[PDB]
Amino acid sequence: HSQSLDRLMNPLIDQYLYYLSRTQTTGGTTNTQTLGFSQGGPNTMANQAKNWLPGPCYRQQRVSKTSADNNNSEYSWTGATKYHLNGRDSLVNPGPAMASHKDD
Amino acid sequence: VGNSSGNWHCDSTWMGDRVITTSTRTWALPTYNNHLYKQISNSTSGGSSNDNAYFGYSTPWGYFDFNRFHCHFSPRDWQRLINNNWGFRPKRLSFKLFNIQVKEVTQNEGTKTIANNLTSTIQVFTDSEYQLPYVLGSAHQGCLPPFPADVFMIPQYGYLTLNNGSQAVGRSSFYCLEYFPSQMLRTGNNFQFTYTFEDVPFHSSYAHSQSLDRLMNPLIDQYLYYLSRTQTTGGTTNTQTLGFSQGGPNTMANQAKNWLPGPCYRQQRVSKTSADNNNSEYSWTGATKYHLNGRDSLVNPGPAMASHKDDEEKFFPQSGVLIFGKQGSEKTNVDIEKVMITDEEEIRTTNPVATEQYGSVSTNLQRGNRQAATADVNTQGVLPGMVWQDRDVYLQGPIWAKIPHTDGHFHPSPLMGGFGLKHPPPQILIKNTPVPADPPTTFNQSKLNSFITQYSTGQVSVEIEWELQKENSKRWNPEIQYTSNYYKSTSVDFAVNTEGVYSEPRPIGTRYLTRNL
Amino acid sequence: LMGGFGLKHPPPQILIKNTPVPADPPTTFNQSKLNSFITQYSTGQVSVEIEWELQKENSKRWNPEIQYTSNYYKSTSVDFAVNTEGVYSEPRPIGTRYLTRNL
Numbered sequence A: 001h002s003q004s005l006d007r008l009m010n011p012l013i014d015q016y017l018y019y020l021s022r023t024q025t026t027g028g029t030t031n032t033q034t035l036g037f038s039q040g041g042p043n044t045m046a047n048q049a050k051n052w053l054p055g056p057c058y059r060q061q062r063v064s065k066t067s068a069d070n071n072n073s074e075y076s077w078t079g080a081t082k083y084h085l086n087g088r089d090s091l092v093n094p095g096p097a098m099a100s101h102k103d104d
Numbered sequence B: 001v002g003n004s005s006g007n008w009h010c011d012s013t014w015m016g017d018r019v020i021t022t023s024t025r026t027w028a029l030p031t032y033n034n035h036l037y038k039q040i041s042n043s044t045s046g047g048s049s050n051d052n053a054y055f056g057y058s059t060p061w062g063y064f065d066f067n068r069f070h071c072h073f074s075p076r077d078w079q080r081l082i083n084n085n086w087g088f089r090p091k092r093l094s095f096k097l098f099n100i101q102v103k104e105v106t107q108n109e110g111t112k113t114i115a116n117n118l119t120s121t122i123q124v125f126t127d128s129e130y131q132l133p134y135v136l137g138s139a140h141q142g143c144l145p146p147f148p149a150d151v152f153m154i155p156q157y158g159y160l161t162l163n164n165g166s167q168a169v170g171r172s173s174f175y176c177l178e179y180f181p182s183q184m185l186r187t188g189n190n191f192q193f194t195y196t197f198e199d200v201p202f203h204s205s206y207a208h209s210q211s212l213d214r215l216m217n218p219l220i221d222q223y224l225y226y227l228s229r230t231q232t233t234g235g236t237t238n239t240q241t242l243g244f245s246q247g248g249p250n251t252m253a254n255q256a257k258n259w260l261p262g263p264c265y266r267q268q269r270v271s272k273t274s275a276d277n278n279n280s281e282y283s284w285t286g287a288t289k290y291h292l293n294g295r296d297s298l299v300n301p302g303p304a305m306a307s308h309k310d311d312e313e314k315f316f317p318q319s320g321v322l323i324f325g326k327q328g329s330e331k332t333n334v335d336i337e338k339v340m341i342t343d344e345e346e347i348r349t350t351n352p353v354a355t356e357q358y359g360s361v362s363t364n365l366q367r368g369n370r371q372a373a374t375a376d377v378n379t380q381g382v383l384p385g386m387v388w389q390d391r392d393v394y395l396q397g398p399i400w401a402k403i404p405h406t407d408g409h410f411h412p413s414p415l416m417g418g419f420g421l422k423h424p425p426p427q428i429l430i431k432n433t434p435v436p437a438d439p440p441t442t443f444n445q446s447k448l449n450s451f452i453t454q455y456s457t458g459q460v461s462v463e464i465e466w467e468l469q470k471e472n473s474k475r476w477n478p479e480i481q482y483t484s485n486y487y488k489s490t491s492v493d494f495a496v497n498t499e500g501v502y503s504e505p506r507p508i509g510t511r512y513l514t515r516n517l
Numbered sequence C: 001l002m003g004g005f006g007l008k009h010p011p012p013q014i015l016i017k018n019t020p021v022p023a024d025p026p027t028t029f030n031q032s033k034l035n036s037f038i039t040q041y042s043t044g045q046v047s048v049e050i051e052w053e054l055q056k057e058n059s060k061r062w063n064p065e066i067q068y069t070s071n072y073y074k075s076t077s078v079d080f081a082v083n084t085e086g087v088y089s090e091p092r093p094i095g096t097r098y099l100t101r102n103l
């Protein structure tokens, strides 16, 4: 896909929907409890309202191809994600579908 | 030039099983980006964090957005639909663009002169193949206004692509809108376009009159037992035992059930009275937010869940609701009397409260020495046997959203409410065709950057046929209808004030009529 | 009570307005409704044809009746005509009850 599921908006227009933006009066010396609402916009793309959510997850342990970056322990079986079935554990491999790593 | 292209149709027609709502409006289209496609990023908008980072393009095109219920239904029509029908869904749409005028404004010597250019055109195409980034359904502004008397300006089309901060990745795509077959229209020409909606489930515009955990016969016991007592009650030395009771009209909580409440993703509970909230800035810290490719995004409004329990109107989930803004309300840090927070409490019958644990699960194996421990389930995905209701619709809220083209989607109903469509009404894009100013008298290979300043106006109609599902309630006592309160006010609700400013005082949902579970 | 014909379905009201024509909008999108318009007004002609049914007088009276007549005496200006400045004026209110009939 050439678009990210969390960036399907129009970057030039704001929304007509608000979100809890500020919870505390900002400064004075004595900033207290308040409730401020902002409209999602091209600068707050993370706070905007979305219609969809990312696919399901079953977290995995992250190992590095450069063995010097990994913890010095035998976690091939201990730190693995594994389902339990009738009293015995099995490796979730390759498991359900998920991205391998973040950017860079 | 001297003959109108169309007429003004802006009324609804009720034919018993269906309603056709037409709505004409007058628009204005300026020239965007001065006819240029500009690359935009979070750095051009003044830089941001990594969560707000983006990379997209601005285009010279505007687009029509009639994806809101108030563009079609009047407050009265909406009330006549909400009080009598159990469900409704759209069947066919019919967009028309006419009475086009391309005015040419020439600002010379402080004196502005606006004259019509009869030979200038506008290009307008509709992406029926969904080859362009679909932008509608993100709840943006620029809709046909709700009141038919006013004229609106057409929003600017711009799309986003993949990014790595403010930069573009390999897969980032650039779509030229000029590479599609538009349709040049001079004054005198009109644009007609028809569309028929796919088969989508009716929107359940009723509340349930029974709770999903009270679907038994309160006079009869069950023939099924449950662990009732684990310890002999008293003596002095009460010891381990096992007693079983039969669920009955007094133990309704222990009875056996066939179904479970809809899924959950717990939200933080804030009070409308700021004195009841913790004194900290948790707008972003205490929020529920999904992680995607290393950056966090607010789950808002998130999936469908009840707002509060019984007798707790003051509390609302932090993100779990749609918050509209009253008329003229600003854009940033506006206070709570400037917004209208929706109340999704009519689904407490099937859906769990947005601000409470879903359930409790055993976390260990009780034994002679180890005792029974249990945990609170904050996030609970679907399970066989679950049943839930979808978010309401809101005469000010969205109508549909395009279901993302993925190979996997569960219950593709939009989280903001509405109808999830795989082939939603296409995006009608429109721009003013460029008209160059006098070119040099000697050839210059450089593209012409001097243009005649102009903008176009005209009318636009949008007719939608909705299928209704009439209410056949065999209930005995009266139901709960939406009604304008009879008390005398300064100004009528859903009417213009003394200055000609139309305002919708409150957010109207659909769930008024009740039905059994 | 003011006279005339009481109708349950009277000639409908013909309403007419000039369609708004917005002045040049901003070059950046503003959600606010456009309040700047091109000043204009329209003119033109209007005709109204009405067919009236009459009920002719069949008086079998012997002596002459009372007709509405413009008094024969010489005036400065004709009645129901324009004065020397082009201003039309109706000098008196004319009713219908002139012809007599038995009860």
Ligand SMILES: CO[C@H]1O[C@H](COS(=O)(=O)O)[C@@H](O[C@@H]2O[C@@H](C(=O)O)[C@@H](O[C@H]3O[C@H](COS(=O)(=O)O)[C@@H](O[C@@H]4O[C@H](C(=O)O)[C@@H](O[C@H]5O[C@H](COS(=O)(=O)O)[C@@H](O)[C@H](O)[C@H]5NS(=O)(=O)O)[C@H](O)[C@H]4O)[C@H](OS(=O)(=O)O)[C@H]3NS(=O)(=O)O)[C@H](O)[C@H]2OS(=O)(=O)O)[C@H](O)[C@H]1NS(=O)(=O)O
Binding pocket: B364, B365, B367, B370
């Ligand atoms: C944090 O870890 C530490 O604590 C946890 C528990 O605490 S916690 O929950 O709060 O975190 C410990 O984990 C629990 O206990 C483990 C353990 O004790 O090893 C282990 O228990 C399970 O397996 C145990 C051994 O089973 S076996 O089949 O491998 O042998 C078992 O205890 C044994 O019970 C058997 C039994 O009752 O049968 C005993 O066998 C004896 O009797 C058998 C039959 O008797 S009969 O009369 O002849 O018929 C004979 O056949 C056998 O020869 C005889 N053995 S003998 O040597 O005494 O002669 C055996 O001796 C016991 O050790 C547990 O059962 S139980 O009986 O103790 O209740 C069994 N779990 S259970 O049955 O579900 O209860 C588990 O990993 C775990 O179980 S738990 O109940 O979920 O907690 C952890 O070990 C401990 N580790 S530490 O931190 O490093 O110190």
